[PDB]
């Protein structure tokens, strides 16, 4: 079961996902969540918090050039940032996201209380079902 995952992004991109501006997330060799998985968004420093989530509506696997042409507009990052991220490979994975949901940020200390040695994932981290319950139990509307 892979219905609940956390990924890290720099705060401008994280905020773009939870606001619905960024509906495509590009990745390089990442484990695949089950369809309609909830993808939690950890925004990196200085935010250092889970700031919301979105749902995985589709997974695309393709070449880097064509994926930029087809989905780059929904991905928010610049073409240079994209090509830098994919330097040295011609393969690319695109997560297509829907139903973005901002929340009051959940800080790194709370995440550590949930999982004692939580670290911002470099690719993705699965949530255990109890972890998912504790996290959901912390969720609130943005202030």
Swiss-Prot record:
Its cofactor is Mn(2+); Ni(2+). It is an enzyme of class 3 (hydrolase). GO terms for molecular function: DNA binding; endonuclease activity; exonuclease activity; RNA binding. Signal peptide: none annotated. Active in the presence of Mn(2+) or Ni(2+) ions. No activity detected with Zn(2+) or Co(2+). InterPro entries: ASCH_domain, PUA-like_sf. Changing residue 42 to F: Significantly reduced binding to ssRNA and ssDNA, and impaired ribonuclease activity. It comes from the Bacteria. Its EC number is 3.1.-.-. The keyword DNA-binding applies. The keyword Cell wall biogenesis/degradation does not apply. SUPFAM superfamilies: PUA domain-like. Keywords: DNA-binding, Endonuclease, Exonuclease, Hydrolase, Nuclease, RNA-binding. Disulfide bonds: none annotated. Residues 8-65 form the ASCH domain. Shows sequence-specific endoribonuclease activity towards single-stranded RNA (ssRNA), with a preference for the bond between pyrimidine and adenine nucleotides. May also have 5'-exonuclease activity. This is ASCH domain-containing ribonuclease.
């Amino acid at each position: 079961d892979r219905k609940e995952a956390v990924i890290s992004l720099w705060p401008e991109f994280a905020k773009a996902i939870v606001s619905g501006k960024k509906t495509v997330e590009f990745r390089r060799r990442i484990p695949l969540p089950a369809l309609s998985a909830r993808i939690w968004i950890y925004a990196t420093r200085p935010v250092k918090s889970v700031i919301g989530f979105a749902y995985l509506e589709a997974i695309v696997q393709g070449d880097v050039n064509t994926l930029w042409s087809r989905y780059g507009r929904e991905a928010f990052l610049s073409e240079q940032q994209y090509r830098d991220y994919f330097e040295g490979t011609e393969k690319a994975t695109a997560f297509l996201l829907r139903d973005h949901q901002p929340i009051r940020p959940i800080n790194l200390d709370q995440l550590k209380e949930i999982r004692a040695n939580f670290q911002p994932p470099q690719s993705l981290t699965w949530l255990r079902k109890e972890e998912t319950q504790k996290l959901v139990s912390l969720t609130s509307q943005v202030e």
